[PDB]
Amino acid sequence: NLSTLLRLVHVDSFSCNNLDKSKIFGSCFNSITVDKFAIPNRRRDDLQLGSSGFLQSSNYKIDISSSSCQLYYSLPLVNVTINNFNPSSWNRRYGFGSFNLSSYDVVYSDHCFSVNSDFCPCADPSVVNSCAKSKPPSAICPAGTKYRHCDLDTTLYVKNWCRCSCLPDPISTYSPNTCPQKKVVVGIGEHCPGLGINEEKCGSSCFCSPDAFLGWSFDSCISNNRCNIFSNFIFNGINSGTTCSNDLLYSNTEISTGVCVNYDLYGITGQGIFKEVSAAYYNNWQ
Amino acid sequence: IVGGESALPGAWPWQVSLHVQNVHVCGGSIITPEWIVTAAHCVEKPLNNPWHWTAFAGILRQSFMFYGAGYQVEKVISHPNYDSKTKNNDIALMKLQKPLTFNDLVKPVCLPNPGMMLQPEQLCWISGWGATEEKGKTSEVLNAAKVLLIETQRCNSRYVYDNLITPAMICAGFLQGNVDSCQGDSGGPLVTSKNNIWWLIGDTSWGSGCAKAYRPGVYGNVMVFTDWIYRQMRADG
Amino acid sequence: VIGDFNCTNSFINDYNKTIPRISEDVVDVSLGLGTYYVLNRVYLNTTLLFTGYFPKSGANFRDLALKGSIYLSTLWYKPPFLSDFNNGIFSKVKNTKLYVNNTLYSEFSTIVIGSVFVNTSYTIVVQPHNGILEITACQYTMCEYPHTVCKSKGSIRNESWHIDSSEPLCLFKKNFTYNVSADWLYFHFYQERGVFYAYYADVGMPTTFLFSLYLGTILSHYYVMPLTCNAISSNTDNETLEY
Numbered sequence A: 001n002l003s004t005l006l007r008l009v010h011v012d013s014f015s016c017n018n019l020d021k022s023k024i025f026g027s028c029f030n031s032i033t034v035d036k037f038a039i040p041n042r043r044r045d046d047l048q049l050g051s052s053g054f055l056q057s058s059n060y061k062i063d064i065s066s067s068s069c070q071l072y073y074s075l076p077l078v079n080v081t082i083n084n085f086n087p088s089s090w091n092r093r094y095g096f097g098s099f100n101l102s103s104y105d106v107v108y109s110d111h112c113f114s115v116n117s118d119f120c121p122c123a124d125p126s127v128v129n130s131c132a133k134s135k136p137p138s139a140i141c142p143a144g145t146k147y148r149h150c151d152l153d154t155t156l157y158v159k160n161w162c163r164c165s166c167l168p169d170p171i172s173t174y175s176p177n178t179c180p181q182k183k184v185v186v187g188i189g190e191h192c193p194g195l196g197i198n199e200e201k202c203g204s205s206c207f208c209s210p211d212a213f214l215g216w217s218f219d220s221c222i223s224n225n226r227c228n229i230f231s232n233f234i235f236n237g238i239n240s241g242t243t244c245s246n247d248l249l250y251s252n253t254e255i256s257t258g259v260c261v262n263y264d265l266y267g268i269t270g271q272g273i274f275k276e277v278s279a280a281y282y283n284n285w286q
Numbered sequence B: 001i002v003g004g005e006s007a008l009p010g011a012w013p014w015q016v017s018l019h020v021q022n023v024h025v026c027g028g029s030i031i032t033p034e035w036i037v038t039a040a041h042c043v044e045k046p047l048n049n050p051w052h053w054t055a056f057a058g059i060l061r062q063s064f065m066f067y068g069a070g071y072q073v074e075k076v077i078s079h080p081n082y083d084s085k086t087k088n089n090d091i092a093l094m095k096l097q098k099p100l101t102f103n104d105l106v107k108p109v110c111l112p113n114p115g116m117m118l119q120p121e122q123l124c125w126i127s128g129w130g131a132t133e134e135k136g137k138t139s140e141v142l143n144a145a146k147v148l149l150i151e152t153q154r155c156n157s158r159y160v161y162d163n164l165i166t167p168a169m170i171c172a173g174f175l176q177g178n179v180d181s182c183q184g185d186s187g188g189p190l191v192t193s194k195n196n197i198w199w200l201i202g203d204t205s206w207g208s209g210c211a212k213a214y215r216p217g218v219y220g221n222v223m224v225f226t227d228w229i230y231r232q233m234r235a236d237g
Numbered sequence C: 001v002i003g004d005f006n007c008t009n010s011f012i013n014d015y016n017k018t019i020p021r022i023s024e025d026v027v028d029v030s031l032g033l034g035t036y037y038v039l040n041r042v043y044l045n046t047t048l049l050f051t052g053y054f055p056k057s058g059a060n061f062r063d064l065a066l067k068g069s070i071y072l073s074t075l076w077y078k079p080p081f082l083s084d085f086n087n088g089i090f091s092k093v094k095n096t097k098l099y100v101n102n103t104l105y106s107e108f109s110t111i112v113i114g115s116v117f118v119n120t121s122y123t124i125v126v127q128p129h130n131g132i133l134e135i136t137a138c139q140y141t142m143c144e145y146p147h148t149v150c151k152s153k154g155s156i157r158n159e160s161w162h163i164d165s166s167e168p169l170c171l172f173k174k175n176f177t178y179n180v181s182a183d184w185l186y187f188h189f190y191q192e193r194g195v196f197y198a199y200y201a202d203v204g205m206p207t208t209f210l211f212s213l214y215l216g217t218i219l220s221h222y223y224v225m226p227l228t229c230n231a232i233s234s235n236t237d238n239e240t241l242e243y
């Protein structure tokens, strides 16, 4: 029911794309997919219908070629919590923890990177021994992944000078093709594979420093002592399925006694006069 | 030359290879038919006695003669303020005893005038006889590649050279790699396209490998040494 | 073969005997057994002559309950176990009570009614979950070897009769409750003019109304899934399955 949804939720703005709100009040669909996430205060303009912002590039992409709606509602700050979890798999493989931020704070991704399975931010310590200038730390990488690519070469008089890849940082590197970490853009219904990891602060087992994870920021979402959360509704098919409306023609009207009224009760037609009479012979199925 | 292609017999008559002891070692370029411009690191003390030097022109594949059909170098003039440690002022001049009359596929390149107003990311071309991928042999055929000029301020970063480029030297190539010259590409004509005429503005002096990341090529800037070349020509006659 | 999908092929027997059982004490309508109340109508003190689908006085029953321990059988999913839903059936089932740590658990078999038991058709399933009847009629994906395991005194197998990665289109879904400590349960199923009806009763002679659904087709077949368990043997507590 549309009336019950907008009443129990403090709706602030509701707009639909490629769909009219007139046909929503009474129809039949196949399925409804709902996506919910918080709204950053500074990035509040990146949720428009078409924008190359930080949210639509690394957090969530909004499809345009499908009939969908946008719901902007607020939630009270009492008895509420925000879950900040990293959906990346290879990042937590090398010992990733949490952002460790204060309450009422959300984490958004602006620089996302995608790597393959054969990837290890760790160098072979047997090779780094012959290095004197810009010697990176090294440790034992688990099996199945190649070590960090580093080369030893002399320029004019420096015998021990080792050069590696992903310098200075994967966010802004001079040779993106040499570094295995490559920038990626999230698609329709896809998360970010992972964030950039500073190889200079990585590596016992290869354990990157918590400050080496770059390519993310945070911002508060408090507005009028309330938190802003976005909701997106996508309809799959129309004039079919079983997910129909309720307030189309039956809005739970009141019983009007005294005058004769048409009957559509449980599949029966006719007219008659109503009269309230106290009875107790009815059961829970009659 | 790495990542390039074989140079067709077009119009590139500004590459002269110097042969000593019947084997190619270093190349050079010509600006006037009385001198040869090349690097100075191959003109060290063990490489004295310029009488044992020959020059070939208009020869793409390095097999057309044997101890003959060449131009004997009369005298070689090098830069007096040359340092063997930092490799600064690495420009040498070789004078031929032959007139070298102009003919087909024989056309020198004019010197760059002061105030060229070169673009930062200017396009350039390289050519020479060197290895193919890494630590290879001398290429039998002539190959060429395309390079770009990078800024000296970006070339002096602590991760690429750590401030080891003098103001008389410039950097060029690609920071991503796969385009660089290996050992054996001494001298080399670094020309560019401007005003429908090529200008020799670079000269390969030294390098750190080829096709390696964060290790671009080093080319000598002949802009400062423009007055030094004119002084040697006037003092000759 | 019930469905058209592969559930499992682990230790499947070839054939067996599997003779049906016929019982005594035929129906007696002299007290109310075999009849059912009206759909949603209340009839006061009077005599009504109703023309409906009722069983014949003096008819025998057939035991279709199947119990397995380790191995299944191919003939279990073949006639005459796969009867025809001509006009309707009347079932008299009992709740198998199991006592574990002074706790009462009652489970019985599952009835499945349909037409061809395929994705492009509808299928009605009524399975009990510790006193909760889940009557759903969706377009499930039935496999060639449907079965169901017991919750209390679980077997060494897993319940797997349908596999679907997404929720299919369903026309009816609602749960019902009944007395767990009951002794016998009765059900009525029949169709007329393209609509389907269902009835259930835990205590008493007549039967109560459940729902009425419109399908537009004509169902022809029905089958009763076997209940694989371990506490329905002779060495365990003496109790059998009857349907």
Ligand SMILES: *[C@@H]1O[C@H](CO)[C@@H](O[C@@H]2O[C@H](CO)[C@@H](O)[C@H](O)[C@H]2NC(C)=O)[C@H](O)[C@H]1NC(C)=O
Binding pocket: C045, C046
């Ligand atoms: C239930 O219905 C029966 C059948 O009509 C009723 O029995 C008759 O009721 C009328 C009305 O009082 C009497 O005149 C007849 O003598 C009754 N006949 C018999 C055989 O008993 C019965 O009274 C009804 N019960 C009620 C209304 O409580």
Ligand SMILES: *[C@@H]1O[C@H](CO)[C@@H](O[C@@H]2O[C@H](CO)[C@@H](O)[C@H](O)[C@H]2NC(C)=O)[C@H](O)[C@H]1NC(C)=O
Binding pocket: C129, C132, C133, C134, C173, C174, C175
């Ligand atoms: C009818 O009852 C069953 C059993 O309690 C419900 O099935 C449960 O559904 C929830 C929600 O998906 C699951 O978390 C449980 O695991 C299910 N239990 C079992 C035993 O399958 C079913 O949802 C109920 N139907 C309705 C319409 O409420």
Ligand SMILES: *[C@@H]1O[C@H](CO)[C@@H](O)[C@H](O)[C@H]1NC(C)=O
Binding pocket: A257, A258, A259, A273
């Ligand atoms: C007409 O009859 C109905 C039902 O008997 C009654 O409810 C209504 O009050 C009557 N109208 C008037 C004007 O008395």
Ligand SMILES: *[C@@H]1O[C@H](CO)[C@@H](O)[C@H](O)[C@H]1NC(C)=O
Binding pocket: C179, C180, C181, C182, C203
């Ligand atoms: C269930 O059956 C038991 C035993 O007959 C009875 O005591 C109990 O009242 C019944 N419960 C209901 C809700 O009918």
